[PDB]
Design a protein around this ligand. Sequence first.
Ligand SMILES: Cc1ncc(COP(=O)(O)O)c(C=O)c1O
Ligand SMILES: O=C(O)[C@@H](O)Cc1ccc(O)cc1
Ligand SMILES: O=C(O)[C@@H](O)Cc1ccc(O)cc1
Ligand SMILES: [Mg+2]
Ligand SMILES: [Mg+2]
Lengths: 398, 398
Amino acid sequence: MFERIDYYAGDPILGLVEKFAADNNPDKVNLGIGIYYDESGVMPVLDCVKIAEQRIADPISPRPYLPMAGLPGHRKGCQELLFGKDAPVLKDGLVATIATIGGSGALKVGAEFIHEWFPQSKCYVSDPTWGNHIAIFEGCDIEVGKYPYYDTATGGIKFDEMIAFFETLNKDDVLLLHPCCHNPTGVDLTREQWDTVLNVIQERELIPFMDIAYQGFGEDMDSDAYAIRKAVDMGLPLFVSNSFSKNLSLYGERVGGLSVVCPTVDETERVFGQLNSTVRRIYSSPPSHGGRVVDIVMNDAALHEQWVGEVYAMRDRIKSMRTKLKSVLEAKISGRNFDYLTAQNGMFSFTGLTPEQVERLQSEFGIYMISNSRMCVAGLNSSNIDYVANAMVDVLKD
Amino acid sequence: MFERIDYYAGDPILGLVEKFAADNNPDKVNLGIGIYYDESGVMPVLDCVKIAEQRIADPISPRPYLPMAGLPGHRKGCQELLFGKDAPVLKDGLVATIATIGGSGALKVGAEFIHEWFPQSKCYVSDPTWGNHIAIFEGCDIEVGKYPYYDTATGGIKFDEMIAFFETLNKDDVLLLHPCCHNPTGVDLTREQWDTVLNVIQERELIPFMDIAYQGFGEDMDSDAYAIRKAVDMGLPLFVSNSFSKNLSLYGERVGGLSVVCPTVDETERVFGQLNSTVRRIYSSPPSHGGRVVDIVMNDAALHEQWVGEVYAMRDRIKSMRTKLKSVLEAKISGRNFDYLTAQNGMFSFTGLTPEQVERLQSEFGIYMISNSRMCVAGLNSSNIDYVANAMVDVLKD
Ligand SMILES: Cc1ncc(COP(=O)(O)O)c(C=O)c1O
Ligand SMILES: O=C(O)[C@@H](O)Cc1ccc(O)cc1
Ligand SMILES: O=C(O)[C@@H](O)Cc1ccc(O)cc1
Ligand SMILES: [Mg+2]
Ligand SMILES: [Mg+2]
């Protein structure tokens, strides 16, 4: 019956993970998975979350369906976070927002909405980018290409080429953009580059789709959202997928948001209604437990403030790891610039190591990265840092 | 920018609900929504669930991604529930199962899988059926039509016409079937009619997709799954979507399962891999909280046994309401047979009332049903029964 069905290769990042677990090097370290670990190398449970969940468990309540858009408080928290509290765009009612099944789920609904209403649009992703972006869009029968982004030569951005690329695109074509904390490179646009980008986006009447999965891990909650807010100030029709997976340490509950910025309230209502309809077609409504956590933590002022602090500690710890890793490298290797390590933002780092060097890191030290050199900085901690930094010096010295 | 966007009419079931809320009749009752309510007119929190959730909160754990297929325990609970404890088909490893975002999510994944690998297959739904079935399938770009089912004349099933219809269909065409507890009619097939249909499905080489959203609300857990188990016995390739929304009273947490019965272990693996790949491109993985609940409740023998007991009481209560409703009607309306009310199974009932009568039921009494005459029996309880039964008497006499 199902002889025609091909085997599924399996998630690539998961394929590596099997190999690491198998590895019997006592000193093995996994830096391959984009998961945040704390000082002790474990996934944290955030204090604010813990508190939110005790409230949810006290008392244990009936579990009616959430609305299709999810909880209003969840929606508002997304909005206030992304566009700023009582931002003009929100007080004008020009943002249609739904809770989603994580950032993935927001990408799916947004892509499906684009596919239905802008059937001609293509989508373009950064070269390189997070593998799942491509699957989600193509899974909607939207054609996906790549725009120039990362400059292998410099470690920077092929900014000129990227800009020239965008001018070739068709009206209503979609750009998948990372407002900060690029996955996998860590290399972000400066504000001035954002203004040029958004300028051409405006001129070419392209659709910007900002995926922000690490708000708070780059500069701060506001800064990380500059690209979003500047697109709003310019009056662009912006799609924003956001995820709480990382910054809430709530990967498994599937919490995120999708927001569509619209030129008029009436368009806001058309789009909101169609987002609902799209949700109804896929999974009907989002999960109550994850949504309640988001609702409680975003809208309780004491919990929100605690939560930002918790995110900033996670960001600060990742920044310390970057600094420490650079300090060892620059102390030990003269005449190579390692500023790109602290210039990069978020959880990810393109190390600049060649595939052969990544592989030698695996064999010789049991240290696991992606072949494109991507390292998750949160994998690093006080207990493994000197071992990893020193292994890296060795591989680069050969 | 979004003037091309059509307004979404809104979920009809949800649309009626708003009119009810707005309604200022002191004695209003809502029988429009397929939600289960206890004797007091409130959504229950089941004891087993409450226990499962105390275990989940003690202690509050890290929240990593579940696997794409969800928790193994959740997958095994679906399987055992659907096909019977340690069934041959399970011991033979011929069932590919994933957790899903409710029954809706399972429908979506199985419809996407069908669309990808059997692009020619069309899907046929019962006339009438639950509104979302169509949207889910059409949302996958699968063409959907209807098979004869409900007989307006007799209140039964146009069984002969249905069977003739199935014989016209192409090989690999999909039938969406309700093992029990038909929505919206309440009218089910007998076991003998099941044997006939599944025979024709076998001879016409059609694909049965069984959606069972109310296991436990018909006769009992095992009886309700007859159509499923008989299809397995016959060696048919079967798709089953199951939902814990009602029978676990866990609508909000989005818990259900998709199961694909395969002729051989190797095909089981192919299908299992692609199900995962399909999950990846939609929402990446399912929610932990809901999945943990299902895991704990299905796999703890004391909780499972308690849980069956809880569903039994819910079913018995619905059955009592059917009997009391019929008794009032037959006592007060001469020469109309109302055995169809007790003959129907599950939460829903096609009351036989015309759209005019349904609408008069709204205007005169604030009693809300679907225009097609669908009533949710769980909406009825000892506090509202007489009032609803007696109002129904008056609409029928005019
Ligand atoms: C017959 C039927 N199938 C599928 C579903 C999907 O619901 P859920 O996603 O909550 O399991 C429902 C209920 O909403 C239903 O009544
Ligand atoms: O960026 C990453 O490494 C994550 O995307 C890893 C991942 C991907 C899929 C998944 O089901 C679990 C983890
Ligand atoms: O069968 C019914 O009437 C409803 O239970 C379906 C439903 C449930 C929740 C929802 O957000 C939309 C439709
Ligand atoms: Mg499609
Ligand atoms: Mg110019």
